[PDB]
Design a protein around this ligand. Sequence first.
Ligand SMILES: CC(C)(CO)n1c(=O)[nH]c2c3cccnc3n(-c3ccccc3)c(=O)c21
Ligand SMILES: [Mg+2]
Ligand SMILES: [Zn+2]
Length: 323
Amino acid sequence: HMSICTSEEWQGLMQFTLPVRLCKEIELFHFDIGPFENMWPGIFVYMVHRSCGTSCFELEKLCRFIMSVKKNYRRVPYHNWKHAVTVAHCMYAILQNNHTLFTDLERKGLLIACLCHDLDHRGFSNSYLQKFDHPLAALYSTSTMEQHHFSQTVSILQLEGHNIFSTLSSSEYEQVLEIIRKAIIATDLALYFGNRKQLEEMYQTGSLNLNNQSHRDRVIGLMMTACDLCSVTKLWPVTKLTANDIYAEFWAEGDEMKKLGIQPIPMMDRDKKDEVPQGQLGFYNAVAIPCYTTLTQILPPTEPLLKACRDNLSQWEKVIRGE
Ligand SMILES: CC(C)(CO)n1c(=O)[nH]c2c3cccnc3n(-c3ccccc3)c(=O)c21
Ligand SMILES: [Mg+2]
Ligand SMILES: [Zn+2]
């Protein structure tokens, strides 16, 4: 079952007007949604209307969908409503800078998938649920949470007056639900490493073709990872604060493992905070930097994401050195 938004919630969203000061700021990659909480659902409406159109979705149905997605996001330290809008904004920025490379159906599907990619996240990783035999792990063997996030997306759409894709043709509706499915599954970090390695091989050899559906799905998959990790592409104080939020969620998972007598990995151990800057260095070198490097190679206008990630790596390197 899903939590439904109140009549006052979507009615207020329909009446929302985005300030002219922000419409110029929202187009840039390094944009931080953080200081505009009350404007987050309205920011998404504006983003949808600028990427797709003012009549792509019925304004009533769209406002109902957004506010109901918000209510189904848990009050965890990182994988919350704030994360969803940050991921959706990064997708908007990528789509805006490479608009014609993607179809109308893909732009609509990817912005919706981004807002729904971590729906009903309980604050626990896939390895935790699989190790401690959580009901979700029995229902989904691999990409546990990601398979659950897609199921919750379908459920929100199945609600009365929430089906934003009902006006699409049967074949297009089937296509948008498959774009969303593959995009949400791609946010499982375990799948990223193999996906980036294949794309690097396809790019280097010059065999990468955007007309090829298998290559298209791989590119979209990398875009999903790049959006999911975009907190590493913000200004250093924003990046620094977001790191505290994800570690509060990692440490809480470790605290749960400790209650069962199992010692977590240093990254999930709050008694091992000193190892966080070195752990961050490893994450940028092996995960973040290669992601944005490959993304820049395939989609050159995404270059500012790699630059901002490199700037934050240099900042973590200054922490280790003592500077
Ligand atoms: C990008 C972020 C949040 C920056 O603070 N970050 C980090 O520093 N370490 C990690 C991190 C470390 C280990 C595993 N996953 C991580 N993810 C993650 C979590 C869920 C789904 C996909 C990726 C991050 O976003 C992240
Ligand atoms: Mg996720
Ligand atoms: Zn995420």
